[PDB]
Every structure is written in structure tokens, then in C-alpha cells.
Structure 1
């Protein structure tokens, strides 16, 4: 079985890609390739390279977001459990400024979503627990919280469909409400 990906651009947000890998499934479970340079590196222009791998473990009803920065490309998926992955267009000069797109991602719907820079990244844990896998492509230093922007999960201009009005939020994401 050769390593494969189905690759398509979003019909809703320009620059967002939906990447679906094949899987070898047997009685032991499943094997799959999330990324290779040769297959996926050509999706990111101007010399910017994936150089950073992160994992985020979270409980049911947790919502992290909406976070973004001016330079980082992100490739995101859920490798255990299930998340409501929401991409928001945070490019003020974009015609789809504050439009959004939801992908319900799990091992049964194993999409990886590519976000260009200046986009809003968020996810809501709809399983008892979830593992979010997160590859970052950027020049220079990692932009931690102080060098990221934040939109409120419940911003009335974006009007995202979320399965709750009382998510488990961090101080940063609560303070974005006011």
C-alpha cells in the first residue's frame, strides 16, 4: 500500500487546505502517514518550512481559541477522540473577513487542515478526551501568547455554531469575551 493524500482547497476560506491520508487497517489497528516533505511541503510558499510538532491533550467541553499570529502556517488534526475544528478568516483585508469553517475531526474522519498566517485557530473537545496534533511552519522564533492575537469564541460578528454556551476556557479566552 503506497502512502497517499487527497488534497483540496476549502470552497469557503481561500488558502485553507483539507488533507486526507490513506490508512493500512488490520486486526491490530491502523497505520498512517500524517506528513512527508515530498508530498505536502509544496503547499507552503516563500521558503517557509514545517519545523515544529506539538500535542495538546484536553477534556470534554474544553474550547481553546480563537488564536492566531502574523507569520505561522498550521497543519492541525485530532489523532484520538473528536474535536470541532473551526478556522476563522482573521485577514482584515480579506473579502471573507470573520467567516468560518468547521471540520469535525477524529480517527474516523482523519482530515488535516492547513491554515495560512493571520487566521483564527480554535477547537472544542466533543469526546471525553482528545489529542490534538499541531505542526507549525514559520521563519525565526516561536510566537507564544504575547505575540498572538485573540478573538472571543462567542464573537457576535463571527457567530460560530458551538455545542455549548458554557465551555471550559482559559483566562486568555475568558478575557477575550470583554
Structure 2
């Protein structure tokens, strides 16, 4: 496996070694040794989630308050999604910036999203299945949303086909980035570095 840090520090694109034969294929999606090699610690898998989405569905932008927040190791096992990470860590040299990766069933790449980042994706095909390992169990009181189409964040969603994305009631009602900043819920860059440092 190869791991490339994104333009948003603390997020990485992972490339698997896919072993192909006449039967189909095989890959190691995560290994403890492989994960430690880029992250500097083991991933404490406390939950694993799965979602299936039709074309044009946008889920996000989601984060978990620090501490302990929720790191996510995310991949697409059918179809394809345009996946985005946003630096919402107040004080970060890259605060308010975002990066993206294409997660699909062809190249079978992965994004690791460390603690205190925001994350979302737009499904590009019907029946796009996403699985993700989580560093913390579901905590709906500590998990929050930011409007995925926030004009300050200005995420360049490749809308299908420029048509508005289809959102949950939750995500459609998501507050502006401005409002989330006023709430005090965003993690601090210093806090997040210290936390991962420990």
C-alpha cells in the first residue's frame, strides 16, 4: 500500500495492492503495520459503517467534536463517489481549505480522515456503496453538520448532471460554516495536533 498526504494535512489517499487472478481479485484493505506506517499509531476500530447511495446523493459535510472526535478510513466497494475533506480546525495554516479523491470500484482507493476534520461525498453512480472504519462509536450529540454547498468553503461538487444534489433532511438543514464557527463546536488546530500527538 502507498499513502499520499492530501493538501489538507491529516488526510491521506491510500492505494491498495490489488492481486488479480482468473477468479476475481483480492486486496488487504487495511493492515495494522500499513496504517501505523503513515499515521504513527494503530487505528482503534470501534465501529464500521456502510451506506448505499443513488447517483447525485450528497452526504455531508460531517464532523465529530474533539475529544475524541472520530477518524474514518473510507472506501468505495461499488460504483463511485467524489469524496471531499475540509479543514475546519480553527487556527490551522490551511483552515477553510478542502481536497478531494475519487473513490471507486476500479482503482479501489481509500481516504483516511483524521480526528477533527469534516468529510463528505457525492455519489456519481447508482448503487454506490461506501464502507468506513471509525475510531469512535456513533455519538449523535457530538456529531454535527456543515452545509455542503457553503459559499465560503466553495467545494466544487461535480454535480450530476449539474442538477442539485439529493440530500437528507438533516444535511439540507445543515447550518452555514459561519454559524458552525459561532457555535464553538469546531476543534482547534492546537488541540487536534496535541490529541493525535498523544
Deviations 1:114-172 (A, max 9, x none): 1111111101110122010101124xxx2433311211011011101112351111111
Q: Which runs of 5+ in 2 are unaligned?
A: 177-198
Relative distance call for 1:150 and 1:122 in structure 2 (3 A) is same
Residue in structure 1 matching 2:118, options 115, 120, 136: 120
Per the alignment, residue 30 of structure 1 pairs with: 25
- Note if 1:9 corresponds to 2:5: yes
TM-score, with length taken from structure 1: 0.87
Q: Which runs of 5+ in 1 are unaligned?
A: none
Matched residue of 2:112: which SS? strand
Per the alignment, residue 194 of structure 2 pairs with: none
Distance in 2 between the 1:109 and 1:100 partners? 22
Per the alignment, residue 66 of structure 1 pairs with: 61
Displacement of 1:92 in angstroms is: 1.4
Q: Give the count of matched residue pairs.
A: 170
TM-score, with length taken from structure 2: 0.79
- The structure that is helix-richer by fraction is 2
Matched residue of 1:85: which SS? strand
Distance in 2 between the 1:47 and 1:130 partners? 28
Distance in 2 between the 1:98 and 1:30 partners? 39
Distance in 1 between the 2:96 and 2:138 partners? 22
Displacement of 1:8 in angstroms is: 2.1
- The structure that is strand-richer by fraction is 1
